[PDB]
Design a protein around this ligand. Structure first.
Ligand SMILES: Nc1ncnc2c1ncn2[C@@H]1O[C@H](COP(=O)(O)OP(=O)(O)O)[C@@H](O)[C@H]1O
Ligand SMILES: Nc1ncnc2c1ncn2[C@@H]1O[C@H](COP(=O)(O)OP(=O)(O)O)[C@@H](O)[C@H]1O
Ligand SMILES: Nc1ncnc2c1ncn2[C@@H]1O[C@H](COP(=O)(O)OP(=O)(O)O)[C@@H](O)[C@H]1O
Lengths: 442, 28, 443, 412, 436, 132
């Protein structure tokens, strides 16, 4: 909705032969990583095999989550992409294996084909019969076109949809039979003796012609987790939004696996596999990794992409150090993509793309200074300096970020190394690990 | 042949009519 | 065409009638002694006379332990209940791990029940309630009875209903002209749909139009059911199915895992033993498979030691890939496979051996056959040497990128250049580790 | 053995029929071992908790030798801190706090069950001079009640309704039912009638069971008009939550006829050609060999609502004049169900060009006379003979045996 | 009654002891451990006398040497209508109950209240059922002709009994039991008539029989607790029953005992693998054994000078010294070759496995050289090898095939130590590559 | 921002008018509902929908009460009796709201400031329903 960190990336920037262009679709360089991600994208879109673990390993500020966002943008619509962090598994109402199972099954979509009927016409007569307490509702609806005229029978939900967005016998409505949705298209008869209660400024449409009832075939995609939550209890649809689905039993999951296989056999539904992206995968316990090692071997498993920036660090939950913070059982069944650091030219055009995304006009010397300070410091600091220098430039009433705006943004806002040097030069003023501080200046 | 309509039973139930010119509310 | 995920090239153990494993049968390559031991275990399960017989699959990573357990499950068939599990799945935040282990123990014991159902079904012709003399007396329902007229094919009937049956009648919104299905066992009423004898095209609800049910209105039908003991335990613990107040409120509350008492399990066992004694039930013990058994702590290990001596326990299959690792939750005890020696004493360890180069090559060839990828002999030999150099799984999981790279060049076969480009694009654990050591910023 | 392969070739449910998919009823109920019929809710759990009379008559029930009633009154009324007779200051303080116009409401709330308090609660008015005001989102929620569509604040609070209508969720099918359904465990105290009345009052509480159901409409009319009871004096009803679909309302699953069609490949191909044949505006004949295939195809055409009549040797000789005459006169007849030797001999079927062979591969002489019932003079369009069966099945042997007989009877 | 075919301790039918509390060498499926069996018989007589409460009994020894077998023998020789709670050490770590509350529930599940009451039952075969109804059905007449093999009678039924007979439909020839007070009518089945099946009752119709109840103190605790009903005995969500309910139940039980309305039946709480409890649970056990309504607690452990849970020091049997002060310790010993051979013969004849003499000698040798439970588990897994080659009696080579197919602890440890690079160590280092 | 057409004021009359041809089997087949709302410096009678009478009799609107009518939803909502009817009973519960200012019918441009978390909270829990 707003301008985010990866908002300049729309796709991977690959041709028909899966060869990465040097600068296309907002992704610059990283040709081995981008070609590998295109291979992952084509393998997901093929959808033949399942449960392949992909690891995107590299240093910080390199383009790992940028690569994942490019994969998700090249995935297109109606394919489930689940992007979670490492810390979201640890829940007080779900176990770690249950949270991982829900994250797995959120990435497998079921594309269900439905046969519906569309009824659009001008309302002639509405008869609504209700009980005295208003509980049992039934009635008849007389709706016509310029050619046909039919009297239908209403139920409780139909009458509930009728009394909402209320139709006053002369409004042209459209009824989706399978979805139960009423859209009042407008008013046609334009009655002279209107009640002076409502704001009768309805749009004037004509009475539709031809067939009153037209059959249609619609297609919608529902993930496996939504079917699990819906079939879990009698109020599962509200638990789909409140997240109050506490440890769904395995019987529901295997019965829904059998039902989805039966729907695939019947031709009613087809399975659309997607991508589960676990950002910062080193922040997972060994219990999570041991569950993932067996969850990848199931048939209903998505293509898991994991990203981590750690070197040989300690695996969580244990007392030993492992490469990328992952045990060798997970690393055996994972396919590792290595991302590499940037040179001056790639950093310069990355900053240029971030500047043109933020609608910030940089001069060439300001871009050179930003490239130099993104070489000396990290890339993300020089990227974050762009909007600050833009606001400084608009403070002095010119729509062009000059050199001195970048100098003022460098002076006002610190990087990591300058703050580290200022802390280490003034260690008495800060609270240390032992809790000792010198508040007094004399 | 032609199937007949379902039997409509509204006994002791409040009636609402919406016609082109005027509405009703047949309460008890 | 289909979906294959690290498995489904294995259809069974691949044994003859003498229990001797062949070399390449059932999608299995090698592991003759382990497959023969698993076949003996399969015969032991099919004998249906044991309880608490626990084995352990021991071996390194990527040697075929989970493959052997899945082959056991495929050889036993779908009628035998199989409960695959992970050692970290026993840690729940709703109930203790003891209760989760006992629930998975009861989930692996199933039974075939021949159940008779008393059924009133037909088309609703009349629906006339009888009001009471005093509806506002405070106690007693508003109505006294409800007369229901049911018509089926070749027969008709009228029923004077209890009000509690009428609650389940009304809750599924039964009107005149609806085909219904009253189950007299639980009082449950299923509204089948609108009758097709009247008009069809005048509805606005996408209802189902159902013809008249054949036979009499009142029926007795025998239905064969397949339930487990854990299903009966959670049915009795959270009672839904009756028409009383507690059964209706049981369906609406949030379902939570509770500590099922020993008294309830003994009562369920008594009723199931009675059902077996009349001859309408047959007990089918099954397999509980706990993969990554090293991740159980000492509490679940001790309760497993207790629960293996129960007279109703299933056959347990365990798997681990640790040599001499301290048991979780403890500090000093060094134990084989992460399993304490008191549990090891009740176990039957089955060793799974690693593979040679030729076994790896034909595993790659059979997995390329199952994945429907064509490979030439030079690329297959390169993939075999590559698999022996790094790991079996890294050569297994590089087949699909090789097929993708072959498809992008508008070719069907996989050549040496495809394997070289997949090697260059994607890295294994060892090469990525070598990248990790030779870096300044932490990679 | 051959006919068993023939009857698994056409439809797999000629051996066993698919029945109801319902939970196992863990229930000892009243079953019959054999002008109206009385059925009463007699469901009981097989698990019985037998309790002695001494505990129920000395610890739960009040008698002269215990102090159940005395201590109950002493704890709930005499020492209650919401009693206005002894704690009027706290009642006035809470009445200023909550704005409740009755100072006895705090005593009534604290001495009622939570479900009962949920049910009996009515939206009474509160005074303005109070500290319990309205926070902003409660206001918005209570503003967006019967607000129509194309309003900003109604659609901003109807996210779940838009997701329900957008995802087509009311026509989805229920995929899970519980394996076992059981009533609560029956507690019995043998030789006591008070415990039976107490158990029946707890299990079948009239206020609670009335609130989870509704009064019939004619009964509501009777008490409102013919008895004069006002609407606010009615028992509260209809507090059961509305289910998702009509499929999710019950745990009993009927045999789906789509699953009946999709387990037979021949019926699946027949349906997928019959849809475009009906869209073409045509008339078709299908020939069979077994009467059970005729019956299953009648049950299929009842779902398809196709105008069809059946001809067979089991039918009498009279009405064979009438279905043929109606077939030749009115055009709205669509499907003609024939047997092989019932309709293939001399029957005037000049209004037919599309004949379909479901499993008729018996003998070439008897098969070749079957479309000869339709392949006659007076035909006004192209005649197409459809023949369908499954590959790699006994019919392969039957069909090339028929082809061998064809070559023998054409050479000779 | 409550059938389950073969278990690990299914061969044990109790302690094998004579009238003078001396153990036979082979009786009731128990061989060996004569001093341990004699001490367990003394503890069994302590329970059977029922005059002494709150005694701690510790069964300690090497693993797989007659510890849980002794408790199963005590429970089998105890007889029914006496409670025997058999819990584990890790069973008390609840998420909705505290450790002391779970221990209190396990303690009070083992003290029974014996109550005898008389009831009136009418059981016989129905001859004829005759209900006359009206149009509205408000008033009805009834005639029930019922019989036993000795009697015939006809009853006039009220409206409530007519309603209770139409509900749970009784026809002619059905055998039913009627309680006149509660009104419960149970269909026992149909009589022996061809034109499920239960024999017709004999003797009187209106019978006066005595039923005997044994209700544990935990059940009265749950029922008397007003927060949750009796269903918490099955759902298990009792949830920290307050101590005032416990005191009221204790005073009411002491009231019923003095008036002769009830009897106290003390039982055994068996805490298997008691070393898994923490020091808080141990001190609650220390102060819970000095109560009137406390069972005789049997604890089993195999730990020897191990670390106590929840502490930082080492204690004998994993238990602190104040708990060992309150306990009398039964020590179990290891087995020789003849006791192991007799145990293997009993376990083979329990599982219907026919053994040769040479196979039994081989099993005894690999039992005295590896483990007893290894040889016990080899029998059932070698019988399948015996029937896989179409042979009834298990020969020596079937045991040898099962020995090479299935590894014990020592062979697996040796194979792990020889191939330590193929497995994951404590540091998470493994080698998967077979080359280099 | 929102635009609301609001009728408010003290009820001066409440006459549910019958139809010219009432249907049998019922009583008081309402053709329209005529209400009379008076406010400060102005009064106006209204011709409402017949279905608003069930909301009036469900919300207990009497003669002399101050009600709040919004246009497109119906949805009567009394706020209390007017202050001119406060001295006819010695004892009573309901507060006496003053006579509302401005015209009876007005368009007020309201501005609502809510956070996104308020929308997530109001959409997570459903609308106030009729289930247990
Ligand atoms: N090739 C690229 N194309 C576009 N943006 C990039 C690229 N590489 C890095 N970036 C920018 O740098 C940052 C990369 O950091 P991040 O996305 O956290 O991945 P990683 O953690 O692998 O470094 C992102 O904010 C992204 O905007
Ligand atoms: N003997 C074998 N024949 C064929 N495929 C095998 C064999 N052993 C292992 N595999 C394959 O190698 C993979 C090993 O994974 P898995 O068995 O799950 O791990 P582990 O060996 O640690 O149990 C499986 O996907 C399986 O398909
Ligand atoms: N005296 C005995 N008679 C028969 N079987 C015995 C005897 N002692 C031990 N066993 C067997 O040894 C196995 C181990 O039981 P036990 O040693 O009592 O428990 P634990 O192994 O927990 O100490 C049991 O399966 C039992 O069958």
């Amino acid at each position: 909705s707003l301008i985010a960190a990866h908002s300049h990336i729309t796709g991977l920037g690959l041709d028909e032969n899966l060869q990465p262009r040097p600068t296309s679709e907002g992704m610059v360089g990283q040709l081995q990583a981008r070609r590998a991600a295109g291979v992952i994208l084509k393998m997901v879109q093929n959808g033949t095999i399942a449960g392949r673990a992909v690891l995107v390993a590299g240093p910080p500020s390199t383009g790992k989550t940028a690569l994942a966002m490019g994969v998700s943008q090249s995935l297109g619509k109606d394919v489930p992409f689940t992007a979670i962090a490492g810390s979201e598994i640890f829940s007080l109402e779900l176990s770690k294996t249950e949270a991982l199972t829900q994250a797995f099954r959120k990435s497998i979509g079921i594309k269900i084909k439905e046969e519906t009927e569309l009824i659009e016409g001008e309302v002639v007569e509405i008869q609504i019969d209700r009980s005295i307490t208003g509980g049992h509702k039934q009635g008849k609806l007389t709706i016509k076109t310029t050619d046909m005229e039919t009297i239908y029978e209403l139920g409780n939900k139909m009458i509930d949809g009728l009394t909402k967005e209320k139709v006053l016998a002369g409004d042209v409505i459209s009824i989706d039979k399978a979805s139960g949705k009423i859209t009042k298209l407008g008013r046609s008869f334009a009655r002279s003796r209107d009640y002076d209660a409502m704001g009768a400024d309805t749009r004037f449409v004509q009475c539709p012609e031809g067939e009153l009832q037209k059959r249609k075939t619609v297609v919608h995609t529902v993930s496996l987790h939504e079917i699990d939550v819906i079939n879990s209890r009698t109020q599962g649809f509200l638990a789909l939004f409140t997240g109050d689905t506490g440890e769904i039993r395995s019987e529901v999951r295997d019965q829904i696996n059998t039902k989805v296989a039966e729907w695939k056999e019947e031709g009613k539904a087809e399975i659309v596999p997607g991508v589960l992206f676990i950002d910062e995968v080193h922040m997972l316990d060994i219990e999570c990794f041991s569950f993932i090692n067996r969850a990848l071997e199931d048939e209903f498993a998505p293509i898991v992409m994991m990203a981590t920036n750690r070197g040989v660090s300690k695996t969580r939950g244990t007392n030993y150090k492992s490469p990328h913070g992952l045990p060798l059982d997970l690393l055996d069944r994972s396919i590792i993509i290595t991302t590499k650091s940037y040179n001056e030219q790639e950093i310069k055009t990355i900053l240029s793309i971030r500047a043109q995304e933020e609608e910030v006009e940089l001069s060439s010397d300001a871009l050179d200074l930003l490239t130099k300070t993104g070489v000396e410091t990290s890339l993300r600091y020089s990227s974050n300096l762009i909007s600050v220098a833009q606001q400084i430039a608009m403070k002095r009433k010119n729509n062009t970020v000059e050199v001195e705006d970048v100098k003022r943004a460098y002076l006002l806002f610190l990087d990591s190394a300058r703050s580290v040097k200022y802390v280490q030069e003034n260690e008495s003023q800060y609270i240390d690990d032992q809790g000792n501080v010198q508040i007094s200046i004399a | 042949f032609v199937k007949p309509r379902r039997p409509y039973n509204s006994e002791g139930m409040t009636r609402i009519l919406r016609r082109y010119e005027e509405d009703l509310f047949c309460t008890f | 065409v289909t979906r294959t995920a690290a498995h489904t090239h294995i259809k069974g153990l691949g044994l003859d009638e003498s229990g001797v494993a062949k070399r390449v049968e059932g999608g299995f390559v090698g592991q003759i002694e382990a497959r023969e031991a698993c076949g003996v275990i399969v015969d032991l399960i099919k004998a249906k006379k044991m309880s608490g017989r626990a084995i352990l699959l021991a071996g390194g990573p990527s040697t075929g332990k989970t493959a052997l357990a899945l082959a056991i499950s495929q050889e036993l068939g779908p009628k035998v209940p199989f409960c695959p599990l992970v050692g970290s799945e026993l840690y729940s935040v709703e109930v203790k791990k003891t209760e989760t282990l006992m629930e998975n123990f009861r989930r692996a014991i199933g039974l075939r029940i021949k159940e008779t159902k008393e059924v009133y079904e037909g088309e609703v012709t009349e629906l006339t309630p009888e009001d009471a003399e005093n509806p506002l007396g405070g106690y007693g329902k508003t109505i006294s009875h409800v007369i229901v007229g049911l018509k089926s094919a070749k027969g008709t009937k009228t029923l004077r209903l209890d009000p509690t049956i009428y609650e389940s009648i009304q809750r599924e919104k039964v009107s005149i002209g609806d085909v219904i299905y009253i189950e007299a066992n639980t009082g449950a009423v299923k509204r089948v749909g609108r009758s097709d004898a009247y008009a069809t095209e005048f509805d606005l609800e996408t209802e189902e139009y159902v013809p008249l049910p054949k036979g009499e209105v009142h029926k007795k039908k025998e239905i064969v059911q397949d339930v487990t003991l854990h299903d009966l335990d959670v049915a009795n613990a959270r009672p839904q199915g009756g028409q009383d107040v507690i059964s209706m409120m049981g369906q609406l509350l949030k379902p939570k895992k509770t500590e099922i008492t020993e008294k309830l399990r003994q009562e369920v066992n008594k009723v199931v033993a009675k059902y077996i004694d009349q001859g309408v039930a047959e007990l089918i013990p099954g397999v509980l498979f706990i993969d990554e058994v090293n991740m159980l702590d000492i509490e679940i290990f001790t309760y497993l030691n207790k629960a293996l001596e129960s007279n109703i326990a299933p056959v347990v299959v365990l798997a681990s890939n640790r040599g001499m690792t301290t048991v979780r939750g403890t500090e000093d005890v060094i134990s084989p496979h992460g399993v304490p020696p008191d549990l090891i004493d009740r176990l039957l360890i089955v060793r799974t051996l690693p593979y040679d180069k030729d076994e790896i090559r034909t595993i790659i060839e059979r997995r390329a056959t199952v994945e429907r990828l064509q490979v030439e002999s030079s690329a297959l030999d390169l993939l075999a040497t590559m698999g022996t150099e790094t790991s079996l799984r890294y050569a297994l999981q590089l087949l699909a990128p090789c097929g993708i790279l072959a498809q992008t060049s508008n070719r069907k076969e996989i050549v040496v250049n495809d394997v070289n480009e997949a090697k260059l694009l994607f890295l294994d654990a060892k090469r990525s580790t070598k990248i990790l050591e030779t870096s300044a910023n932490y990679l | 053995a051959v006919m068993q392969f023939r009857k698994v070739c056409n439809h797999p449910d000629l051996f066993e029929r698919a029945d109801v998919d319902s939970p196992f009823s863990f229930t000892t109920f009243g079953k019959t071992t054999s002008k109206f019929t009385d059925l009463i809710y007699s469901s009981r759990n097989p698990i019985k908790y037998s309790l002695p009379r001494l505990i129920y008559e000395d610890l739960i029930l009040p008698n002269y030798n215990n102090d159940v009633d005395i201590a109950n009154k002493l704890k709930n009324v005499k020492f209650n801190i919401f009693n206005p007779s002894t704690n009027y200051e706290l009642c006035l303080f809470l009445s200023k706090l909550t704005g409740e116009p009755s100072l006895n409401e705090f005593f009534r709330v604290s001495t009622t069950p939570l479900l009962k308090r949920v049910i009996e609660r009515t939206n009474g008015p509160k005074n303005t001079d109070s500290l319990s005001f309205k926070t902003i989102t409660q206001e918005l929620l209570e503003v967006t009640r019967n607000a129509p569509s194309e309003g900003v604040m109604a659609s901003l609070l109807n996210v779940e309704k838009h997701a329900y209508e957008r995802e087509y969720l009311n026509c989805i099918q229920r995929g899970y039912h519980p394996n076992v359904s059981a009533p609560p465990v029956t507690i019995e105290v043998l030789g006591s009638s008070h415990v039976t009345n107490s158990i029946n009052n707890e299990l079948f509480d009239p206020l609670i069971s009335q609130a989870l159901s509704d009064i019939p409409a004619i009964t509501q009319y009777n008490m409102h008009v013919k008895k004069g009871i006002p609407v606010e004096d009615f028992p509260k009803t209809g507090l059961f939550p509305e289910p998702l679909n009509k499929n999710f309302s019950s745990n009993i699953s009927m045999p789906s006829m789509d699953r009946f069609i999709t387990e037979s490949a021949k019926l699946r191909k027949l349906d997928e050609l019959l849809v475009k044949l009906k869209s073409e505006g045509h008339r078709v004949l299908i020939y069979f060999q077994m009467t059970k295939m005729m019956d299953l195809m009648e049950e299929y055409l009842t779902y398809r609502q196709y105008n069809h009549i059946r001809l067979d040797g089991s039918s009498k000789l009279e009405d064979r004049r009438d279905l043929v005459h109606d077939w030749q006169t009115n055009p709205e007849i669509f499907v003609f169900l024939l047997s092989t030797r019932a309709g293939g001999l001399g029957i005037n079927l000049t209004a037919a060009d599309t004949v379909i062979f479901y499993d008729s591969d018996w003998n070439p002489t008897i098969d070749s006379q079957a479309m000869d019932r339709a392949h006659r003079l007076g035909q006004t369009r192209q005649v197409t003979v459809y023949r369908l069966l499954v590959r790699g099945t006994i019919e392969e042997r039957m069909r090339d045996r028929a082809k061998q007989k064809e070559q023998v009877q054409q050479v000779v």
